[PDB]
């Protein structure tokens, strides 16, 4: 997808002139560059394809941070985590999607598991993940029967294995994910995306049995939206995030220092 060439534009003046408009119409202003420059013809021939949605959305980024410690004293209980799936707590990805009313995409999901040693060695280690759609029984324990997964998407990683990935199709009960919402679940709390965006949760858990090595596991989890579509653009976030689902921005004991920077006088660039 390309710009047109630009023609040569003859130096002229006339009673006809498009340089004037009514921006108040809502329509964008007097469109044409050849109107006020006596141009030479140029093969303006620079592709917009990097500017495509399947480009701009369609680069991966990190989403969330599954940090865990391997507890010893009840290894069997504690050594798992669960995270509520959202695009709302890493700013760059958030701001890609905080750009529209709604968006739809299939998802590359990519896992960057990392083991950090608090001990002289780590040995072999294996780690489980599960997508927990809502109303799956959430694992309560590193020994919970819920680690069995006859139909839940559960996947494994271990020391020395390559980065896991999967393709997750577009999920919503609706046509597109709400980037924002203007009301409630029907009895009137959780205003906005905390209503609509119940994807349930990701989960993780050490699969190797009790062993002597005190370790931290950290998974950085990444995603890229592809086969994307998006719906009615909306203005970018001006200030630091605060509250995942909620658009809150007035932070506690703080002030609204936006991306705009002041200057001494408006006659000085």
């Amino acid at each position: 997808l390309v710009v047109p060439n630009i023609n040569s534009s003859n130096p002229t003046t006339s009673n006809s002139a498009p340089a004037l408009d009514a921006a108040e119409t809502g329509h964008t202003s007097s469109v044409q560059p050849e109107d006020v420059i006596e141009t030479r013809y140029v093969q303006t021939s620079q592709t917009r394809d990097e500017m495509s949605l399947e480009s701009f959305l369609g680069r991966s980024g990190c989403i969330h941070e599954s940090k865990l410690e391997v507890t010893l004293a009840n290894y069997n209980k504690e050594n798992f985590t669960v995270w509520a799936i959202n695009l709302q707590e890493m700013a760059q990805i958030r701001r890609k999607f905080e750009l529209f009313t709604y968006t739809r995409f299939d998802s590359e999901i990519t896992l960057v598991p990392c083991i950090s040693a608090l001990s002289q060695d780590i040995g072999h280690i294996t780690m489980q993940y599960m997508y927990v759609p809502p109303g799956a029984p959430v694992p309560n324990s590193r020994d919970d029967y819920a680690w069995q997964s006859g139909t839940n998407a559960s996947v494994f990683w271990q020391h020395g294995q390559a980065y896991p990935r999967f393709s997750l199709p577009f999920l919503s009960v609706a046509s597109a994910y709400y980037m924002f919402y203007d009301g409630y679940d029907e009895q009137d709390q959780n205003y906005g995306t905390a209503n609509t965006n119940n994807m349930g949760s990701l989960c993780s858990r050490i699969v190797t049995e009790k062993h002597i090595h005190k370790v931290h596991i950290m998974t950085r989890i990444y995603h890229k939206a592809k086969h994307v579509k998006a719906w009615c653009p909306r203005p970018p976030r001006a200030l630091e995030y605060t509250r995942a689902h909620r658009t809150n921005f007035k932070i506690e004991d703080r002030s609204i220092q936006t991306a705009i920077v002041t200057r001494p006088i408006i006659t000085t660039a």
């Binding site: 394809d49 399947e54 369609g58 299939d106 590359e108 393709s167 577009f170 890229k224 592809k226 086969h227």
Partner: peptide
């Protein structure tokens, strides 16, 4: 068939179509 912007043939092979995650313009 070959790639329209290009000079070679390549096409899907993974099973279910949504899982591809790579689109034309």
């Amino acid at each position: 068939a070959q790639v329209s912007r290009q000079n070679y043939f390549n096409i899907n092979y993974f099973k279910d179509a949504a899982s591809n995650g790579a689109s034309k313009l």
